[PDB]
Amino acid sequence: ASSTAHKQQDINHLLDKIYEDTKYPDLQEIAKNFNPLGDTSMYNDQGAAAEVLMKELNDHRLLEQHHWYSLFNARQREEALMLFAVLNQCKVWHCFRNNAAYFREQMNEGEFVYALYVGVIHSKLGDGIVLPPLYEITPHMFTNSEVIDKAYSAKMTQKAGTFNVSFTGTKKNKEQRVAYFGEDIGMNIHHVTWHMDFPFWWQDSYGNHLDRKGELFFWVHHQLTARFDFERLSNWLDPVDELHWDRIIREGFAPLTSYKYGGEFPVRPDNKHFEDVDGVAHVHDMEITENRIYEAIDHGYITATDGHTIDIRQPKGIELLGDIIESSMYSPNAQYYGSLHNTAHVMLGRQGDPHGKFNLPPGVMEHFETATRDPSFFRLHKYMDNIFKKHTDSFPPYTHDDLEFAGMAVDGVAIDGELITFFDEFQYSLINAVDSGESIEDVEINARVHRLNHKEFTYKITVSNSIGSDHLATFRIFLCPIEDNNGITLTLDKARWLCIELDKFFQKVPSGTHTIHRSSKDSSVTVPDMPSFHSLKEQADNAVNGGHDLDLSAYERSCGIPDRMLLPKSKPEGMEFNLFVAVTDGVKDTEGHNGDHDHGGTHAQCGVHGEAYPDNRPLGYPLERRIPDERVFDGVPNIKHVVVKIVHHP
Amino acid sequence: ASSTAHKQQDINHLLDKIYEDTKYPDLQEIAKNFNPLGDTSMYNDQGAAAEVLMKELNDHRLLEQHHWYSLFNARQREEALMLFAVLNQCKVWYCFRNNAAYFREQMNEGEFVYALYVGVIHSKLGDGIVLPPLYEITPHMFTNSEVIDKAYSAKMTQKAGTFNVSFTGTKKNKEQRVAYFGEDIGMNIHHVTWHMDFPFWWQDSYGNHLDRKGELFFWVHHQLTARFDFERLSNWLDPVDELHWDRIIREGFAPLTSYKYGGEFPVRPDNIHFEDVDGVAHVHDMEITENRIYEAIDHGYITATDGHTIDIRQPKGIELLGDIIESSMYSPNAQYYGSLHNTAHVMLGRQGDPHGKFNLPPGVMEHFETATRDPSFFRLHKYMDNIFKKHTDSFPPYTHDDLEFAGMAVDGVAIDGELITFFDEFQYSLINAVDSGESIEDVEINARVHRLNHKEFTYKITVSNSIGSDHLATFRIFLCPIEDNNGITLTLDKERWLCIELDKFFQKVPSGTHTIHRSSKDSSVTVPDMPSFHSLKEQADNAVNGGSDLDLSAYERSCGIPERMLLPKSKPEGMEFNLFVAVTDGDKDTEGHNGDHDHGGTHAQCGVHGEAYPDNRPLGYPLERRIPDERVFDGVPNIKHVVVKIVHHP
Numbered sequence A: 001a002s003s004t005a006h007k008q009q010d011i012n013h014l015l016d017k018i019y020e021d022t023k024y025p026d027l028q029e030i031a032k033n034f035n036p037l038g039d040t041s042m043y044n045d046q047g048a049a050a051e052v053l054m055k056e057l058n059d060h061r062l063l064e065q066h067h068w069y070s071l072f073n074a075r076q077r078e079e080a081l082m083l084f085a086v087l088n089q090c091k092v093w094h095c096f097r098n099n100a101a102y103f104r105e106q107m108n109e110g111e112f113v114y115a116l117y118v119g120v121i122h123s124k125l126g127d128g129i130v131l132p133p134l135y136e137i138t139p140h141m142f143t144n145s146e147v148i149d150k151a152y153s154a155k156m157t158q159k160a161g162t163f164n165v166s167f168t169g170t171k172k173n174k175e176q177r178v179a180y181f182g183e184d185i186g187m188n189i190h191h192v193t194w195h196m197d198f199p200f201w202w203q204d205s206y207g208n209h210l211d212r213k214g215e216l217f218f219w220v221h222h223q224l225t226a227r228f229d230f231e232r233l234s235n236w237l238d239p240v241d242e243l244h245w246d247r248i249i250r251e252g253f254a255p256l257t258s259y260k261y262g263g264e265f266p267v268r269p270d271n272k273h274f275e276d277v278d279g280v281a282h283v284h285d286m287e288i289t290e291n292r293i294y295e296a297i298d299h300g301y302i303t304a305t306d307g308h309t310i311d312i313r314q315p316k317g318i319e320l321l322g323d324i325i326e327s328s329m330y331s332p333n334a335q336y337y338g339s340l341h342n343t344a345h346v347m348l349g350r351q352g353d354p355h356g357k358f359n360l361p362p363g364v365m366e367h368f369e370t371a372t373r374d375p376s377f378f379r380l381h382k383y384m385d386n387i388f389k390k391h392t393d394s395f396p397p398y399t400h401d402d403l404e405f406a407g408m409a410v411d412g413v414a415i416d417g418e419l420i421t422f423f424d425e426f427q428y429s430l431i432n433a434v435d436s437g438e439s440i441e442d443v444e445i446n447a448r449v450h451r452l453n454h455k456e457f458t459y460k461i462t463v464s465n466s467i468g469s470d471h472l473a474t475f476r477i478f479l480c481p482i483e484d485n486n487g488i489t490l491t492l493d494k495a496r497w498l499c500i501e502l503d504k505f506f507q508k509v510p511s512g513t514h515t516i517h518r519s520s521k522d523s524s525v526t527v528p529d530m531p532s533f534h535s536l537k538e539q540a541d542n543a544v545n546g547g548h549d550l551d552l553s554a555y556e557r558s559c560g561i562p563d564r565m566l567l568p569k570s571k572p573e574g575m576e577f578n579l580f581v582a583v584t585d586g587v588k589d590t591e592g593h594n595g596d597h598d599h600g601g602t603h604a605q606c607g608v609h610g611e612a613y614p615d616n617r618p619l620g621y622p623l624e625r626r627i628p629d630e631r632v633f634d635g636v637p638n639i640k641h642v643v644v645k646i647v648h649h650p
Numbered sequence B: 001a002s003s004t005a006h007k008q009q010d011i012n013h014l015l016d017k018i019y020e021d022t023k024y025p026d027l028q029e030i031a032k033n034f035n036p037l038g039d040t041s042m043y044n045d046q047g048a049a050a051e052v053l054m055k056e057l058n059d060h061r062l063l064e065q066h067h068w069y070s071l072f073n074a075r076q077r078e079e080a081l082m083l084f085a086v087l088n089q090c091k092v093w094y095c096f097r098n099n100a101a102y103f104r105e106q107m108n109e110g111e112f113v114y115a116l117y118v119g120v121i122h123s124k125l126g127d128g129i130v131l132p133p134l135y136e137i138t139p140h141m142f143t144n145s146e147v148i149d150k151a152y153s154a155k156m157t158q159k160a161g162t163f164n165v166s167f168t169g170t171k172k173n174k175e176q177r178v179a180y181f182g183e184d185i186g187m188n189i190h191h192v193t194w195h196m197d198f199p200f201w202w203q204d205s206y207g208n209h210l211d212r213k214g215e216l217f218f219w220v221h222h223q224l225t226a227r228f229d230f231e232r233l234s235n236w237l238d239p240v241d242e243l244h245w246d247r248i249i250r251e252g253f254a255p256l257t258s259y260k261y262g263g264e265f266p267v268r269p270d271n272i273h274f275e276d277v278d279g280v281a282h283v284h285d286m287e288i289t290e291n292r293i294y295e296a297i298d299h300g301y302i303t304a305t306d307g308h309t310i311d312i313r314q315p316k317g318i319e320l321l322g323d324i325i326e327s328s329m330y331s332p333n334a335q336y337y338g339s340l341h342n343t344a345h346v347m348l349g350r351q352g353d354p355h356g357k358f359n360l361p362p363g364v365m366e367h368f369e370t371a372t373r374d375p376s377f378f379r380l381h382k383y384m385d386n387i388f389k390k391h392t393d394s395f396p397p398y399t400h401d402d403l404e405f406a407g408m409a410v411d412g413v414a415i416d417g418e419l420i421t422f423f424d425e426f427q428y429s430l431i432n433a434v435d436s437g438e439s440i441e442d443v444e445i446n447a448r449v450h451r452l453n454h455k456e457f458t459y460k461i462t463v464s465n466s467i468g469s470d471h472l473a474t475f476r477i478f479l480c481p482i483e484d485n486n487g488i489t490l491t492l493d494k495e496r497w498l499c500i501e502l503d504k505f506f507q508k509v510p511s512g513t514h515t516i517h518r519s520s521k522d523s524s525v526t527v528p529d530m531p532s533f534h535s536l537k538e539q540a541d542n543a544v545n546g547g548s549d550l551d552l553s554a555y556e557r558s559c560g561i562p563e564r565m566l567l568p569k570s571k572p573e574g575m576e577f578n579l580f581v582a583v584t585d586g587d588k589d590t591e592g593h594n595g596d597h598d599h600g601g602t603h604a605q606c607g608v609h610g611e612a613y614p615d616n617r618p619l620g621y622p623l624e625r626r627i628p629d630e631r632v633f634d635g636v637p638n639i640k641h642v643v644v645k646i647v648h649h650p
């Protein structure tokens, strides 16, 4: 009943053809006859959350079905979180399943999908379930309008087909050169799943604390920004500028994408000034909020609601800044510091209709599914990144004694295999996006996208352990630019904030000289492509129908940079980069988190499900402080960088 | 085979399901086996137009099927006109039908529909045919995207339905108050049909001259502008401003409409400056063109290609100005005067993507089907109207002796019946917008729109004829504002350019005192709603089946203000207007024609099919010259105005 096979099948069924009433008789029967309030002993709160939601439902206060949904819309988010709160209180699976089935048929589908995903992720009852990829559950949020139109035509004509996705804009638009980054369906899943794992609305009263969430918020977005700039460099473009509230947003955007319900996503013209957005904020409010955050950074303390100071000149300072900048419910003082980043998403998202005169739906910036499609995403997030950077730059540069792992030398760094990127093809189903007739048969309708990929390779890191015993070590691997787009050689201080994280792992180094081997496929920064909805249905159905146990444990989380995007595209002619390796004291770094324990496949930016973050060092260590004197790093034996070449095969 | 029944049936079939290969086996056979080059005696040009078009087709130089079409696109227009030129040379119906069937399957559907319409209108072979309403042949061009999506959903689910249309924008957008004017499907048919009847590309080598076309171009757009402003006054709004190339376009527009192929129509933000449009014109080019036209007006002559003067200080001057402003192929000097109005349509239409960076399709301003949906249409056309007005204002005011119809006195003007407007509901089919499969039964899919309408009324004009014999008189009826939106009473000079034409008719006035009656239904300014495609199919099919002479001589042209929009909306509280009646010398006005003959039902602005324009007076007579001294008009017995009240019933 609560076996993995049945829970997976239940989730598959709940998410199937999400825009129509359920076609599964058992779910129909539950939605008709189950009473969320019939037996409140099924809830750890004795029904408090179910009472809240049922009262909103019965008073007709919930968003209707067949309507756009945005997580950044306060009331719509509150409604989705009402359902999450019910699911989160369920003691046993039948409560979770029955409430999901009941509210699927009552609530807006966007709210429902969101609540069910975060309910699965944050309830112990969801352990072992593999969530289908959102690009097959709500394909409109991941597929351009032209391809959706071809899917609608296939359905109108009752003919199967597979349709090729191209990028938006034209070759005249130089920004299209890097569309493969922000439009990649896996990169978008990475982004929404990170926020599902680490939601800004999280309150620890829901069950557990999300360790170092505010610092992970800084880090994951710093890495998105740095990775995008690496693609720009690969394509003869300059780095993104930062946004500013008093300066023009140079690069506009035409999504050429549509909601299933709500119309086409709005366009933003080139070279527009920010306008006040009715019901959201004035541009001036954003500037004041920014000023208040910088006041805290430059003071070295955050001001509490009663005026007392909260020291941020300590390792948790960056985390507390993440709390107040995002902002999350961990913010000590949202009345004063507001919500710079989340409000900025909405401010930018609404610039195509800032006063609501045109009845346009929210912009792509107002969904984590779609935000990175928009060039301005990266200008906004570089702007935010620079706020964090003023804090991280305020600390003293590391010294030799800070950085040295005594008796541990990196003798050599090499790669087995060529660093080669290419584009290949990937398919996903559009069936959930089309409308099914009563008693007419489905037909297969697929999208085919070109996605970046790379060949497998292996790091060979030769280390000498001259301590009298084997020692746990953390291997930290970054890719750093050597020259900018003007051919100017970068100093280490000018490169460090541009480096992208490639790996982090903990491994015992035996005494003597040994070469550590690490496969690119095992990176703690990346996760594989998601299994298809069809595959999850097939596996769950086969297990349930045969009475077999379903073991999906080999599947990884959906949070993490796609494996295929580990490396920047680079150029056909080749580009050289610095491969930076820091080997640090693993006993110190993992103290309290065990260096033998399993930390999963995505701990670098996505942490460890249900556990504390396993690396005590500041995110970005040892590159997160100013390095004005390269001699300091060059004198540390446990740090080494080497030149590598990446070639794109067109 | 040349009977009206069969010709109508043939046209109905050619226009059915226009986005798909023809489903009529007889048209299929023609398209496969007919040779446009197979009998030059079919054509009045010995086959030349057919050779020209076949060479473009055989060289693969024609626009592909399933692609947007804009009449303002030079090459696409040239291709459509190549097919028009063939149809126009056919001597007999089978040539016309067979070429249309042949090229339907070879040419872009937008080009084909355009060419077939103008071919029917401008060939004697088209006499008696009633063209289906374009809003049922290409419903995307008349139906917002939300309703189209519901139609697509109805087809995907194989379920018939009727869906309600409910105007673009929000109530926060004051411009939405008057959306019922420019978005009315019949107003859009009026506009496209006027341009089909009087095309700017016309050359008299096609067979006949279009009498007074350049002046009718001024007048029909002056009346569109003046009618729109009457709706604004009815809705507590100020008049539209005029466009200026160096000033902001205040009112943006979100069409919320889509092409069948080509994507969503582009949005224009509020408060934008004009930008240069790559491949079209620089904004400065528009200013220079405007300056050159005003140079001609203020010189009193147009400058020919060799520099000699073309006098415009004469009644034809306004027509020659229309020729050079539109501009049409009647322009004596397009190298110098350019094409201000047509280029302006494209400049405005492309302001959502002026450099083509985002690959957006042409704007609503780039089709006569859609142009009036855009608020900026009326700002552009008031701007153009003011150019014409500098010319019309340059002439001396009329004198008593100019205006008096001696022995003819208007004793009284009254209306039988209250002047009442309201909104009612109107339905049209969306079937041609959806995709039909192979062997898939149609389901009925309709759109329902709310449209302005009014109650029937009758003019009672009491006239005393003391000439001594019966005399032909022209009755000219205008509706004029009494006060502006600020409650300021307008002088006659300030009213005259705001007056809207309600009627013009020729009638013998007997000796003595008599009351002329004229039904609102018989206005020469208006035409009824088009018969539906379904009704035309039924009537053609019923006539063909059973050997019954189809005669549709009961229907009118599609050029003309819709009868339902004869009156401005007005207010629920009522508004008072001046009803202005000028009775003028019908002998003088129709000299060189036939005054008491059938002029059709739409001669005021749409002329008479295949005949000279029946009224020799300047368009707008007697209101088209300055009236600085109202005493002149008050002293003329054959002019009278009276106050009438129009009430809106909500």
Ligand SMILES: *[C@@H]1O[C@H](CO)[C@@H](O)[C@H](O)[C@H]1NC(C)=O
Pocket (backbone or CB within 6 Å): B164, B425, B448
């Ligand atoms: C559409 O309009 C008709 C008549 O105005 C009405 O009866 C019907 O309920 C409307 N449908 C919707 C969905 O509003």
Ligand SMILES: [Cl-]
Pocket (backbone or CB within 6 Å): B513, B514, B515
């Ligand atoms: Cl009488």
Ligand SMILES: [Cu+2]
Pocket (backbone or CB within 6 Å): A191, A195, A221, A368
């Ligand atoms: Cu994010």
Ligand SMILES: [Cu+2]
Pocket (backbone or CB within 6 Å): A221, A341, A345, A381
């Ligand atoms: Cu963000």
Ligand SMILES: [Cu+2]
Pocket (backbone or CB within 6 Å): B191, B195, B221, B368
């Ligand atoms: Cu026009």
Ligand SMILES: [Cu+2]
Pocket (backbone or CB within 6 Å): B221, B341, B345, B381
């Ligand atoms: Cu025009």
Ligand SMILES: [Mg+2]
Pocket (backbone or CB within 6 Å): A521, A522, A523, A524, A525, A526, A527, A528, A556, A601, A602
């Ligand atoms: Mg991994």
Ligand SMILES: [Mg+2]
Pocket (backbone or CB within 6 Å): A399, A400, A631, A632, A633, A634, A635, A636
């Ligand atoms: Mg050193």
Ligand SMILES: [Mg+2]
Pocket (backbone or CB within 6 Å): B019, B020, B021, B022, B065, B105
């Ligand atoms: Mg075809």
Ligand SMILES: [Mg+2]
Pocket (backbone or CB within 6 Å): B281, B285, B286, B289, B338, B339, B340, B343
């Ligand atoms: Mg020009």
Ligand SMILES: [O]
Pocket (backbone or CB within 6 Å): A371
């Ligand atoms: O984000």
Ligand SMILES: [O]
Pocket (backbone or CB within 6 Å): none
């Ligand atoms: O975010």
Ligand SMILES: [O]
Pocket (backbone or CB within 6 Å): B371
């Ligand atoms: O127009």
Ligand SMILES: [O]
Pocket (backbone or CB within 6 Å): none
């Ligand atoms: O026009």
